[PDB]
Each structure stands twice: as structure tokens, then as C-alpha cells.
Design an enzyme around this catalytic site. Structure first.
Site, PDB file in Angstrom:
ATOM      1  N   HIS A  22       0.851  -1.226   0.000  1.00 48.75           N
ATOM      2  CA  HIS A  22       0.000   0.000   0.000  1.00 48.75           C
ATOM      3  C   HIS A  22       0.873   1.258   0.000  1.00 48.75           C
ATOM      4  CE1 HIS A  22      -3.382  -2.753   1.054  1.00 48.75           C
ATOM      5  NE2 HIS A  22      -4.012  -1.914   0.229  1.00 48.75           N
TER       6      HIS A  22
ATOM      7  N   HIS B 222       1.795   1.543  -5.755  1.00 52.78           N
ATOM      8  CA  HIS B 222       0.375   1.109  -5.860  1.00 52.78           C
ATOM      9  C   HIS B 222      -0.464   2.289  -6.360  1.00 52.78           C
ATOM     10  CE1 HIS B 222      -3.504  -0.590  -5.105  1.00 52.78           C
ATOM     11  NE2 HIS B 222      -3.764   0.278  -4.141  1.00 52.78           N
TER      12      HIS B 222
ATOM     13  N   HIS C 153      -5.870   7.538  -3.328  1.00 53.00           N
ATOM     14  CA  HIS C 153      -6.933   6.672  -2.760  1.00 53.00           C
ATOM     15  C   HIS C 153      -6.437   5.883  -1.540  1.00 53.00           C
ATOM     16  CE1 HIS C 153      -5.166   3.227  -4.774  1.00 53.00           C
ATOM     17  NE2 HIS C 153      -5.987   2.460  -4.044  1.00 53.00           N
ATOM     18  N   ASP C 154      -5.129   5.702  -1.336  1.00 52.13           N
ATOM     19  CA  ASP C 154      -4.569   4.948  -0.177  1.00 52.13           C
ATOM     20  C   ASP C 154      -3.575   5.822   0.619  1.00 52.13           C
ATOM     21  OD1 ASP C 154      -5.859   2.328  -0.010  1.00 52.13           O
ATOM     22  OD2 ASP C 154      -4.620   1.631  -1.666  1.00 52.13           O
TER      23      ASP C 154
ATOM     24  N   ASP D 294      -8.154  -0.508  -8.617  1.00 52.24           N
ATOM     25  CA  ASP D 294      -7.524  -0.853  -7.319  1.00 52.24           C
ATOM     26  C   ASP D 294      -7.011  -2.289  -7.346  1.00 52.24           C
ATOM     27  OD1 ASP D 294      -6.586  -0.357  -4.759  1.00 52.24           O
ATOM     28  OD2 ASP D 294      -8.580  -0.412  -3.839  1.00 52.24           O
TER      29      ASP D 294
ATOM     30  N   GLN E 238      -6.197 -17.421  -3.370  1.00 51.12           N
ATOM     31  CA  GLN E 238      -6.173 -16.617  -4.627  1.00 51.12           C
ATOM     32  C   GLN E 238      -7.299 -17.057  -5.571  1.00 51.12           C
ATOM     33  OE1 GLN E 238      -3.611 -13.770  -5.784  1.00 51.12           O
ATOM     34  NE2 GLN E 238      -4.676 -13.815  -3.834  1.00 51.12           N
TER      35      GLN E 238
HETATM   36  O1  LIG Z   1      -4.885 -11.202  -3.697  1.00 55.30           O
HETATM   37  C1  LIG Z   1      -5.707 -10.803  -2.870  1.00 55.30           C
HETATM   38  C2  LIG Z   1      -6.200 -11.688  -1.887  1.00 55.30           C
HETATM   39  C3  LIG Z   1      -7.129 -11.247  -1.012  1.00 55.30           C
HETATM   40  N1  LIG Z   1      -7.539  -9.960  -1.056  1.00 55.30           N
HETATM   41  C4  LIG Z   1      -8.496  -9.444  -0.152  1.00 55.30           C
HETATM   42  C5  LIG Z   1      -8.376  -8.127   0.304  1.00 55.30           C
HETATM   43  C6  LIG Z   1      -9.320  -7.595   1.171  1.00 55.30           C
HETATM   44  C7  LIG Z   1     -10.414  -8.364   1.562  1.00 55.30           C
HETATM   45  C8  LIG Z   1     -10.555  -9.672   1.078  1.00 55.30           C
HETATM   46  O2  LIG Z   1     -11.620 -10.463   1.449  1.00 55.30           O
HETATM   47  C9  LIG Z   1     -12.906 -10.389   0.790  1.00 55.30           C
HETATM   48  F1  LIG Z   1     -12.894 -11.108  -0.431  1.00 55.30           F
HETATM   49  F2  LIG Z   1     -13.870 -10.995   1.595  1.00 55.30           F
HETATM   50  F3  LIG Z   1     -13.305  -9.046   0.655  1.00 55.30           F
HETATM   51  C10 LIG Z   1      -9.585 -10.201   0.237  1.00 55.30           C
HETATM   52  N2  LIG Z   1      -7.111  -9.123  -1.946  1.00 55.30           N
HETATM   53  C11 LIG Z   1      -6.219  -9.413  -2.849  1.00 55.30           C
HETATM   54  C12 LIG Z   1      -5.858  -8.332  -3.807  1.00 55.30           C
HETATM   55  C13 LIG Z   1      -5.560  -8.513  -5.121  1.00 55.30           C
HETATM   56  C14 LIG Z   1      -5.322  -7.270  -5.689  1.00 55.30           C
HETATM   57  N3  LIG Z   1      -5.469  -6.343  -4.780  1.00 55.30           N
HETATM   58  N4  LIG Z   1      -5.835  -6.974  -3.590  1.00 55.30           N
HETATM   59  C15 LIG Z   1      -6.049  -6.288  -2.378  1.00 55.30           C
HETATM   60  C16 LIG Z   1      -5.197  -6.530  -1.309  1.00 55.30           C
HETATM   61  C17 LIG Z   1      -5.360  -5.885  -0.084  1.00 55.30           C
HETATM   62  C18 LIG Z   1      -6.369  -4.957   0.099  1.00 55.30           C
HETATM   63  C19 LIG Z   1      -7.220  -4.707  -0.970  1.00 55.30           C
HETATM   64  F4  LIG Z   1      -8.188  -3.777  -0.822  1.00 55.30           F
HETATM   65  C20 LIG Z   1      -7.078  -5.365  -2.204  1.00 55.30           C
HETATM   66 MG   LIG Z   2      -7.530   1.288   0.219  1.00 53.98          MG
HETATM   67 ZN   LIG Z   3      -5.552   0.557  -3.081  1.00 46.12          ZN
END
Ligand SMILES: O=c1ccn(-c2cccc(OC(F)(F)F)c2)nc1-c1ccnn1-c1cccc(F)c1
Ligand SMILES: [Mg+2]
Ligand SMILES: [Zn+2]
Ligand SMILES: [Cl-]
Length: 313
Positions: A68, A72, A106-107, A217, A269
Site C-alpha cells: 500500500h 500502488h 486513494h490509499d 484498485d 487466490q
Molecule cells: O490477492 C488478494 C487476496 C485477497 N484480497 C483481499 C483483500 C481484502 C479483503 C478480502 O476479502 C474479501 F474477499 F472478503 F473481501 C480479500 N485481496 C487481494 C488483492 C488482489 C489485488 N489487490 N488486492 C487487495 C489486497 C489488499 C487490500 C485490498 F483492498 C485489495
Molecule cells: Mg484502500
Molecule cells: Zn488501493
């Protein structure tokens, strides 16, 4: 006014593509963003002196966290640049100004921790903002930086144009709260399926802009497999640090954040691609057909993770 930023030929060509990686040269990222603002919006929409001072203050307020971080921010702005450039006539002058700035900001001041960790830790921000905690903070930091002397890149907007662009940026940043994505996409799916989706309805545009923000994002999942795979390490480095901080509060973290359950990452994933990423890019492709390359790239990476599970890598 006659000072165009120009990139080397490979970057000049590849920056137009959804799957562009901004590369490891930190000191080129500001030039890459101005280049994108100039082609997306015009050399006129911002005073270069003001824009440059804004970019360097935004950079300064991104922390040295694994994912973050400032890279990013510029990566997310680039994906929005690609959507705006592939959907030229759909977006107002103010939307193109707002959304690139929204993405860069945004972050802002992210510490590498989820809203959930702030709430369990009982962080003061969780008392100030009960939902979308970090996202309200991100918008707060954007406004504060805009209000530094010589940083107001919108100062040549009228009072109402100015209020509109900050409202675009607020909604855009709040939308990057993934907890809000699920409902937003469900509603967009229904409106698309029933044919009630109307881009002249402001509340409909807001929803479509929110989904573009989720799409920009999450765009690390739409890169070539080596970028996607190497970004996942940065993503999981933060998750596992959060997992550690949960165990310090005497809480078993969800397996995604437990560095003991590192074996389970490939299956986690799949769940993320199936539950979040693919649906996001599907609905974005339905609403904005020219963003299909993001869906195709996302599907290719799902396939690459399936190959990881099947032992083939
Ligand atoms: O590879 C990933 C695995 C899991 N989550 C994730 C994130 C947050 C809630 C989450 O759980 C859910 F599905 F229930 F919401 C899963 N995000 C990614 C991902 C890929 C690209 N960007 N991000 C991302 C990362 C951190 C933060 C972010 F905002 C995005
Ligand atoms: Mg964010
Ligand atoms: Zn972000
Ligand atoms: Cl153009």
C-alpha cells in the site's frame, strides 16, 4: 504551456495497454502520471507548478509498506488512465480531472492494515470513522494536501465545479472500500440485466465510477503473470504482518493473514479471483465493453493459479 512530458518509445507504446507495469525506477513515476494527466485531460487542466508540488506531497504521505505504497498509487492511476483513454466520449471534463487524482490519492497514509485491524486494535481513526475507516482517512489526507499553499490544482474551477470534483473524489475513494464493492456490483449487475442502467442518472454514474475504482484498485491481478505473481508477495507480506498483530491482540487471524497457513495461498487466490476479481471485471466489461482486456488478463491469471495448485508450478 508547450512543455509536453515525453516517455521513451517502449513506455510511450506500452503505457496505453491495460497490463503496463510502471517499472522499478521510482523517479520516473511522477513524469508517468503527468504524461497520463496531459493525454487524458489536457496540458491546460492543471498548472504544472501546482500539479508537481501536489504529486510530491502525495508521494511524501505514502508510507514505506510492502504493497500500500506510492507504486500502488501510480499503478492504480495508470489503470484508470487506460479505462478513460479506451472510453473517450463517456466521461465529462471534471470526471477525467477528478478520477486520476482520486486514484493517486486513494490509499494516502495507509499503514498496511485493514479497517478490521483498526477496529480490533481500537485505533482512534476507528472512533472518528465507524465504517470505511481508512478510506475516510484517505479522503481527509487528500483535502489536507489540496489545502497546502501552492497545492490547489483545482483553484481555476468555479465554486460549483470545485464542489463537484471533490464530491467525485470523495465517492471514488470511499468506493475502494472492498466491503462496499459486493453490493455495488450486485446492483450494477441487476440494472444491466433489467436494462434500467442509465449513465444520465447521476446515482448510476456514481455506481459505475465506484466499480471502475474497484477495477483499477485490484489491477495487479490483470498484469502479466510474473508481475501478478511478484505483486502477490507484497500483498501477502502486509496480510501476514496484520496476522502477527492480530495474534499480539490475542486473536487467531483468518487463514489469509496467518503466515503458518502459507501453503493455502494458491487456493485463497482462486477464491479471491472467483468471489471478487472475475465478477468485478465481468460487470465492468458488460458496462464498458473496451475494458475486456482486464477480464481476459484476469482469467489468464486465474488459470496460472490453477496450474500452481495442480503442481505444474
Ligand atoms: O490477492 C488478494 C487476496 C485477497 N484480497 C483481499 C483483500 C481484502 C479483503 C478480502 O476479502 C474479501 F474477499 F472478503 F473481501 C480479500 N485481496 C487481494 C488483492 C488482489 C489485488 N489487490 N488486492 C487487495 C489486497 C489488499 C487490500 C485490498 F483492498 C485489495
Ligand atoms: Mg484502500
Ligand atoms: Zn488501493
Ligand atoms: Cl486521446
Amino acid at each position: 504551456g508547450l512543455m509536453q512530458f515525453t516517455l521513451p518509445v517502449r513506455l510511450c507504446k506500452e503505457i496505453e495497454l491495460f497490463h503496463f507495469d510502471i517499472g522499478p525506477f521510482e523517479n520516473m513515476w511522477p513524469g508517468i502520471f503527468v504524461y497520463m494527466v496531459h493525454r487524458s485531460c489536457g496540458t491546460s487542466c492543471f498548472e504544472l507548478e501546482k500539479l508537481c508540488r501536489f504529486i510530491m506531497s502525495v508521494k511524501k504521505n505514502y508510507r514505506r509498506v510492502p504493497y500500500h505504497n506510492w507504486k500502488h498509487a501510480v499503478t492504480v492511476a495508470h489503470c484508470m488512465y487506460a479505462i478513460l483513454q479506451n472510453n473517450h466520449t463517456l466521461f465529462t471534463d471534471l470526471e477525467r480531472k477528478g478520477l486520476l487524482i482520486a486514484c493517486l490519492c486513494h490509499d494516502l497514509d495507509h499503514r498496511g492494515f485493514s479497517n478490521s485491524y483498526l477496529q480490533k486494535f481500537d485505533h482512534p481513526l476507528a472512533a472518528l470513522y465507524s465504517t470505511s475507516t481508512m478510506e475516510q482517512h484517505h479522503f481527509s489526507q487528500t483535502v489536507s494536501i489540496l489545502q497546502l499553499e501552492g497545492h490547489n490544482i483545482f483553484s481555476t474551477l468555479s465554486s460549483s465545479e470545485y464542489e463537484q470534483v471533490l464530491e467525485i473524489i470523495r465517492k471514488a475513494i470511499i468506493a475502494t472500500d472492498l466491503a462496499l464493492y459486493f453490493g455495488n456490483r450486485k446492483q450494477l449487475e441487476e440494472m444491466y440485466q433489467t436494462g434500467s442502467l442509465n449513465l444520465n442518472n447521476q446515482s448510476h454514474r456514481d455506481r459505475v465510477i465506484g466499480l471502475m475504482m474497484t477495477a483499477c484498485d485490484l489491477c495487479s491481478v490483470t498484469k502479466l503473470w510474473p508481475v501478478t505473481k511478484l505483486t502477490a508477495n507484497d500483498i501477502y507480506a502486509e496480510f501476514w504482518a496484520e496476522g502477527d498483530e492480530m495474534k499480539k491482540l490475542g486473536i487467531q487471524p483468518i487463514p489469509m493473514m496467518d503466515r503458518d497457513k502459507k501453503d493455502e495461498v494458491p487456493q485463497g487466490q482462486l477464491g479471491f479471483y472467483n468471489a471478487v476479481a472475475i465478477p468485478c471485471y465481468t460487470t465492468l466489461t458488460q458496462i464498458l465493453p473496451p475494458t475486456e482486456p482486464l477480464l481476459k488478463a484476469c482469467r489468464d491469471n486465474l488459470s496460472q493459479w490453477e496450474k500452481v495448485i495442480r503442481g505444474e508450478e
